Amino acid sequence: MGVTEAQYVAPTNAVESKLAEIWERVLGVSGIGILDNFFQIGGHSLKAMAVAAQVHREYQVELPLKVLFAQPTIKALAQYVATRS
For residue 60, tell me if it sits in a domain.
yes
Are the beta carbons of 78 and 40 closer than 8 angstroms?
no
**Quick check: is 9 in a domain?**
no
Burial 31-42 (b: 16+ CB within 10 A, else e): ebeeebbebbbb
Rounded CA gap, 77 and 18, in Å?
20
- DSSP letter, residue 75: G
**Helix, strand, or coil (residue 36):** strand
> Does some domain include residue 5?
no
Q: How many helices (H) and strands (E) does the chain have?
A: 3, 0
The verdict on residue 56 lying in a domain is yes
How was this model experimentally determined?
A: NMR
Within-domain flag for 41: yes
Asked if the structure places residue 24 within a domain, the reply is yes
Which residues constitute the domain of residue 35? 14-85
Q: Tell me, what amino acid is at 85?
A: S
Residue 2: inside a domain? no
Q: What is the CATH number of the domain that holds 24?
A: 1.10.1200.10
Counted domains in the chain: 1
Structural domain includes residue 36: yes
15: left (phi over 0), alpha (psi -120 to 50) or beta: alpha
